[PDB]
Design a protein around this ligand. Structure first.
Ligand code: NI
Ligand code: NI
Lengths: 110, 109
């Protein structure tokens, strides 16, 4: 049907120490999640068997690893990890923000 | 996997008042950064085959979703499943929205 997401209207949910998120929007094929990292918070390297993922950097910076290759990403930069692609991140500045986008939707995050 | 470094890519003209950069894509997922001049209009339209999310990162837009209007600023978003009418009017110079699609929009390449 269609929805709006008003950021101010939604709390941060705890993912783990130094990491918070908010589910932004989704359909069965497409999901956006806003993720907030303290400086030095770590997204452990991992792979998705069934989901594609793009991380778009909105604030702060991240060192992102894609299958061993590292790149420093600052606001406006992005990575894409097709499914079966190892990726991980380390946040380099306070309140680093990345938009994780997925296809299909990540039902495990509800 | 692939990286997109914004400083390495030029803006591409879409139409008057509108430029973009294709950020990243797989066959099932695509991100596009779209820049609007103030008062530039994305005329209302539907996609037969693509779900769309617009995530606002700079400036402000009035977004129309099946006749409902909201003013969206940085951090706000809309979701338009396929067959949902949506359009936008940019409210500020250099207003930026990340349009997200599934599957990818091959017509943009
Ligand atoms: Ni992931
Ligand atoms: Ni559209």
């Amino acid at each position: 049907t269609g929805s709006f997401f008003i950021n101010h209207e939604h709390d941060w949910q705890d993912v783990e120490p130094g990491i918070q998120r908010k589910i932004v929007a989704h359909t069965p094929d497409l999901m956006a999640v806003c993720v907030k990292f303290d400086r030095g918070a770590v997204g452990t390297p991992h792979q998705h068997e069934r989901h594609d993922q793009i991380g778009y950097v909105v604030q702060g910076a991240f060192e992102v690893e894609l299958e061993g290759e590292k790149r420093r990403l600052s606001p406006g930069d992005a990575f894409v990890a097709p499914h079966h692609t190892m990726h991980g991140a380390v946040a380099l500045e306070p309140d680093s923000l990345v938009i994780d986008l997925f296809s299909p939707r990540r039902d495990d995050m509800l």
